[PDB]
Design a binder for this molecule. Structure first.
Ligand code: CYC
Ligand code: CYC
Ligand code: CYC
Ligand code: CYC
Ligand code: CYC
Lengths: 48, 161, 160, 193, 48, 65, 161, 161, 160, 160, 161, 160
């Protein structure tokens, strides 16, 4: 039911089990010159 | 565990002598300020679900920490953050009723680097939550009772950092 | 391309194209593998050219991004990097086709009437592609950067 | 000869001329000449590859500063700022600057001085502090280079802390939390304690 | 197994089965005899 | 590079601490990199440097320790 | 704990975004190999006393680690060692089936390098055991699924070494 | 203190036998990838001050820890932390060249869980920062040496805890 | 000199040089005729690089060339180019030595002390030798520039 | 190895590895393929090289064999021939290691007082490894027996 | 402690110019003769005990100074001179690989003259011992490597005198 | 404080409190009411000092504000006013304590390693706190501005 706080560092501070504990990736978005360049229509076939 | 009464009669036990007039004057210095604390401990006990409500909105809310990427994002983490704050009001009223920060060295400053470091809790937001909580508590309890309560809030965050 | 430019050169004189012109096609296609290798590393490093050549531009000339200038604001700086991003797309188009003609038929017919109307200085937008030339050749090797740099020099040569 | 016996015995914790048949012999000749002083014979011993094979490359950099002070200064570290002065020297220039910053200190030359060997200053030879009473005699034992986790900085920082989260009866009474087995940090194998 | 088939019969509950499990000699050898005493207080308190 | 030095360094603490006095006015090679920390240490005790002479080192190099 | 779907949710939850078109192909690469991993586990479990038999037959048997001057020698320490090798295989079935090594880092790699120095068993023989377990397994299951099982074998060997 | 060369020497020395063909295969594997690590150890030691100001500015700056209360609020503790984190990049590229994580274990990783709990620093923000140092070095010396760097950053963060 | 590092290593243990160490000297001496040929490309192209890498510096860092910077004015930037020209000169000492100890005891013992007082940004100096690296490595053959690029590379990291 | 002795020399200076040290490791792994041919050559000729070098040991020094010495016993010479095989265990290690680093801590550190304790003459081993060296230089070609003989003659003077 | 590599660098820096054509021809003079110096060094490192064994038997033994009444009558002194003679060969080896007497000038020469006269060591008996030792190494190493051996043993023999 | 510094010096000589430091402390504590009504007026006008020295810095150092400098952009130049907010906040701790051990332990002892690791010029802060001094001496009266202005002048000496 409970576990010692030094023992939780043994369990969950590994490399594989860290993304569920704190933030890890922090994706920067598309930069605003790229999304100003798209024709707001990402797919087109015969009308090319 | 001890208070102002049981620090005097602990320190005067261990010398072997009885209670003397130098130590009874220390008890009367606690008995002169005892009536101030029971008025102070009553009003916080009727507002324990509301001091926490305002102080989270003072410094924590609408921040990075409330937002995803911050720590108190998931509802599961969020309630806990009220609960891991609500011990800091209940144990601070106990030390205010004691007149000694010996409870605070004993129940609520043991793992308080190592639990919060091994759980992703930022230390620097908890210290900013507590003097956001001290400002609304000393506003609620008065100027005289606010500095006696203000010792035991600043005893916690000094030991927590 | 040189295939398009030699068909219509032979179409107006209305005969089959000469082996002096056919050998230029044969040297074009046999060097066709190398020019995709120039382009496909620039497209894979597309974001890490424009962010630095833009920052080398505003550091060199500060009045553009300064308030009162044309590109002031986070929106106006962003759209004045697309105006740099559009030229990096055409330079990668000109590297694949071998000639400057997909830039000449797209990018540089009326720039002196475009930016006179839009208010941006034409001298400053020729400085940004010079910052783009100094970034992209550093990301390419010693031999291949010279043939890529000629199409960078034609873009500065059309605005100036 | 029994001086240069004891100079090896002070620095390298045991007579490694008698027990391992090795020690740099050109340095003794400059020592026995009277050319270099006994302060210099310690310092040129401290920068030797015999010392960094024995007491620097086997330990953590925080453990080296506690281990060098028992060698050259003859005492434990007394203060966490006095640790933190010497720990910046180890990031500055490594071992050769750390032995330079300690043998040339005024703590050295007031006590040992110029033409005597360093001797470890235990209880009775001078007055001893009460702040580091525990890990100083523990550092003065012969079991000092096998305490791998550092002594002083784990309790110079702990005096400013509150009571650390462990078992109530010490860290050695706290098992590792795995599926089975009941493993324990045995305090006699590696001194966690 | 003579601790076990009392549970399979239903003659004991599980809480009585845990007590008759951890009074055996195989538990006593593994976590009481071969340990320090206040370690062995703490580890049986950890498991049960 | 190292150079010898004759220096006489009294202690000004042996009245207080009551130690065995070692007899100064020594000669030792101090190396070039470690000398000015050791030279300043002679000034903190107030000892007087008598003679500094370059033993080895050929003064004026740009490379070669 | 978490698997290849839960992690790519939790990679895209803490950013605050939805599931974009940059994370669906992380799921679509998982769901393409979804039928491959379930056939890989069902030949492990049918041979699980023979993969552990052929692994020790190339490394530990007839050596002098099972000599009387050896670690393996008493049969209490043998049957633990097969069982301490059972728990490396059975969790390697799990992480291949999950597609993420997080179950290895919680329970197998909990304190395993610090237990082994506290016990005195050698680590350099254990990496020789699991790398002998890797060459038996990839022959049995198949050279497709032996590649993805070889990652989670060596992830234990990265944690032991 | 061991190399990937000398561990194959030492593990073939406790048995007392000579160099077997698989042992020479381990030495011929390290000799085959010998020139890759020295092309990385130049480039990381070139930008050793550029990575430490990039991974800190990625995942550690503008948080609460540089704000008051946190463990980076001091200029004594900012400059201690870059001193705490230059060691992790310097000893990793030491261990990159030797091919053995034995240098990290007895120079860095021995007292590091016990000093960091004693001084009261976040282990969870340190292991954030060393993992933030991974993708900077992976995007600097290419994917081949960076994945070969990533076995020795993830030996640091495995050994912190 | 890689010889002198081996002498102080063997003197510090009072022993002769090991045959592991003498194999390093034997590979050093038989490559020493290659070592002088690296410096003769850089000495004969000394003025080409400095005029190039000056313009490579001043596009990437024109905070120096703008007034208020450390080298503003044409008398100052001539002194900024000879501070570059010392470092191209010193690398040709360090290439033919085999060691980096002529770069050390001449150039980078107190370089964070001198350039702290002199007011110049030392990150721009570390930009400047990096701007000197990209053109000088392209002038060499790629096998020789692998070794010669490393002596450039210690000058980058020991700056900042 | 030569890598660890490059690292722990550069760890005590608390810097990174110098490029003077980084060509030492780079030339080491190119020449590592030569010395592992020596390690296969010494290991295959192991059973031959013990008995003939001991045969030349006995005619040079009969004091071990004769009564009044140590090895006057049919078991007591068999530990001597294993003891010669214990050193050729080490000699093939340091050839692959590129140093005498496996010669040091496994084979040479305590031997001056170990053999003083046991009663065997330390000078008597110093021709037995030398008699081993004269056979090991015979099976090997002279451009490889020069360096493989050099690992032997390090240990010869280190005994006496 | 400077080299023929470094002294042509130092002479090119006390001027302040580049490597000129005269500085090239000094360096190629070193690299042509440097291949035999390493081959000279392996032989004298091999016979470093055997040379000194018969160097004393030519000149030191059965004379007045190894007799009673002489200098070397004590076993400390006869051990000291072999320790003095192994250093003279080892430092002349160090002068041989650099090719300069600057290695020989810094370490050994500054204190031999005034302290042999302080300890009563006969310099006029020392010099014919070591110039006998310079004769016996030329028969061991060959004549072409023997000439540059002879110019640094003269440099010791000039420094003693 | 001074009271710590008088104890710690008297503790090192292991005597009692001298008649010297009995009168340094007594003269400090009868000036204790004077220094707090110095230090209140800094905190009472902290929004004016930061705004005026922020106005005074950026005209002196326009390389910072211009793009490619460090404090460029409305989030970054808000942090440089916050970067100066701490140093005004620290000086009020030093005026109350009567010494600079609040300045030393919090805002001095690792500054040059930190500001090199952030990209800002170190001496540009040393102009700014000097510009912060020039608005703080216009607040106070004359006999107190020599006292509180010395604590500003200590902070300049830590930077440069
Ligand atoms: C030797 C053939 C002659 C001789 C020598 C002798 N020398 C000593 C003592 C010393 N010699 C030195 C000289 C050096 N030591 C060094 O390290 C170096 C540089 C590598 C040199 C040049 C020194 C410093 C001493 C004193 C140190 C000591 O004695 O331990 C002795 C011993 C004198 C004594 O009374 O102790 C002797 C006997 N004697 C001969 O027979 C030859 C003429
Ligand atoms: C592929 C061929 C092509 C070109 C050439 C092109 C130019 C182009 N640039 C534009 C705007 C712009 N371009 C800039 C660019 C700059 N401002 C400066 O001062 C700098 C000198 C410079 C970049 C280095 C700015 C600020 C605007 C917005 C104009 C405004 O809002 O006033 C616009 C109007 C809005 C838009 O559609 O972006 C066009 C059509 N579009 C094209 O499709
Ligand atoms: C997955 C979660 C999990 C882990 C990590 C686990 C680990 C584990 N392996 C262990 C023991 C052991 N481990 C070994 C090791 C080996 N066997 C050999 O002979 C070789 C030398 C080597 C491997 C090739 C040995 C011999 C023991 C028994 C030690 C002993 O009884 O003294 C022990 C001690 C248990 C005991 O001895 O009573 C534990 C806890 N059990 C688990 O459920
Ligand atoms: C109380 C002691 C204390 C100090 C010394 C301190 C410095 C400090 N300055 C910072 C940033 C900064 N400080 C500046 C400052 C300036 N830009 C300029 O060029 C001007 C010269 C200058 C000030 C006028 C800038 C630009 C940054 C942001 C750096 C970046 O994000 O790249 C940051 C990181 C951002 C953050 O706070 O989260 C720290 C920790 N913090 C402290 O708590
Ligand atoms: C060579 C192996 C080795 C390491 C790594 C090492 C670290 C080490 N880090 C220390 C402090 C520290 N380490 C950190 C680092 C951090 N804290 C944070 O908040 C961040 C998450 C993280 C860095 C980004 C900080 C801030 C301190 C100072 C704590 C204090 O001064 O009280 C100290 C105490 C000395 C001092 O504070 O001056 C040591 C000995 N010692 C060693 O021997």
């Amino acid at each position: 039911r409970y576990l010692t706080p030094g023992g939780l560092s043994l369990r969950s501070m590994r490399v594989g089990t860290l993304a569920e504990k704190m933030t890890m990736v922090k994706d920067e978005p598309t930069p605003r010159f790229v999304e100003l360049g798209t024709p707001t229509d990402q797919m087109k076939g015969e009308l090319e | 565990m001890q208070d102002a009464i049981t620090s005097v009669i602990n320190s005067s036990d261990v010398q072997g002598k009885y209670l003397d007039a130098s130590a009874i004057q220390k008890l009367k210095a606690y008995f002169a300020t005892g009536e101030l604390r029971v008025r102070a401990a009553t009003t916080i006990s009727a507002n324990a679900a509301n001091i926490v409500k305002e102080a989270v909105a003072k410094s924590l809310l609408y921040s990075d920490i409330t937002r995803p990427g911050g720590n108190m994002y998931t509802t599961r983490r969020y309630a806990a953050c009220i609960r891991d704050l609500d011990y800091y009001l209940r144990y601070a009223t106990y030390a205010m009723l004691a007149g000694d920060p010996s409870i605070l060295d004993e129940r609520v400053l043991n793992g308080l680097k190592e639990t919060y470091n091994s759980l992703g809790v930022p230390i620097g937001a908890t210290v900013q939550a507590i003097q956001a909580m001290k400002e609304v508590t000393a506003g609620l309890v008065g100027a005289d009772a606010g500095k006696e309560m203000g010792i035991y809030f600043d005893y916690i965050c000094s030991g927590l950092s | 391309s040189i295939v398009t430019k030699s068909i219509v050169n032979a179409d107006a004189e209305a005969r089959y194209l000469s082996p002096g012109e056919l050998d230029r096609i044969k040297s074009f296609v046999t060097s066709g593998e190398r020019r995709v290798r120039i382009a496909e590393t620039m497209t894979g490093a597309r974001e890490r050219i424009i962010k630095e050549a833009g920052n080398q531009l505003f550091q060199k000339r500060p009045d553009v991004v300064s308030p009162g200038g044309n590109a002031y604001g986070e929106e106006m700086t962003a759209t004045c990097l697309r105006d740099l991003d559009y030229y990096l797309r055409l330079i990668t188009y000109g590297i694949v086709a071998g000639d400057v003609t997909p830039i000449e038929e797209i990018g540089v017919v009326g720039v002196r009437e475009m930016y006179k109307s839009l208010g941006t200085p034409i001298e400053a937008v020729a400085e940004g592609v010079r910052a783009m030339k100094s970034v992209a050749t550093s990301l390419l090797s010693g031999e291949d950067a010279a043939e890529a740099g000629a199409y960078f020099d034609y873009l500065i040569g059309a605005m100036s | 000869l029994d001086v240069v016996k004891a100079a090896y015995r002070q620095v390298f914790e045991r007579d490694i001329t008698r027990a391992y048949s090795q020690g740099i012999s050109d340095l003794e000749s400059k020592f026995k000449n009277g050319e270099i002083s006994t302060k210099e014979f310690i310092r040129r011993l401290g920068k030797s590859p015999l010392y960094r094979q024995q007491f620097y490359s086997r330990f953590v950099n925080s453990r080296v500063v506690e281990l060098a002070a028992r060698h050259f200064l003859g005492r434990g570290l007394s203060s966490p700022e006095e640790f933190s002065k010497y720990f910046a020297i180890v990031t500055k220039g490594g071992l050769a600057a750390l032995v330079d910053a300690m043998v040339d200190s005024t703590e050295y030359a007031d006590y040992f001085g110029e033409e005597t060997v360093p001797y470890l200053r235990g209880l009775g030879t001078e007055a001893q502090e009460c702040r580091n009473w525990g890990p100083q005699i523990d550092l003065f034992n012969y079991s000092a280079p096998f305490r791998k986790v550092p002594q002083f900085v784990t309790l110079f920082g702990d005096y400013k802390q509150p009571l650390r989260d462990q078992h109530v009866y010490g860290i050695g009474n706290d098992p590792l939390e795995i599926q089975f087995g009941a493993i324990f940090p045995k305090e006699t194998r590696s001194p966690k304690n | 197994t003579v601790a076990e088939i009392k549970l399979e019969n239903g003659d004991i509950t599980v809480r009585e089965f845990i007590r008759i499990l951890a009074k055996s000699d195989v538990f006593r050898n593994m976590y009481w005899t071969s340990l320090y005493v206040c370690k062995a207080i703490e580890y049986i308190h950890r498991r049960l | 590079r190292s150079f010898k030095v004759t220096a006489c360094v009294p202690s000004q603490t042996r009245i207080r601490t009551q130690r065995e006095l070692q007899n100064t006015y020594f000669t030792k090679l101090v190396p070039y990199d470690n000398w000015f920390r050791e030279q300043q240490r002679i000034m903190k005790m107030g000892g007087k440097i008598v003679k500094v002479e370059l033993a080895t080192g050929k003064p004026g190099t740009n490379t070669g320790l």
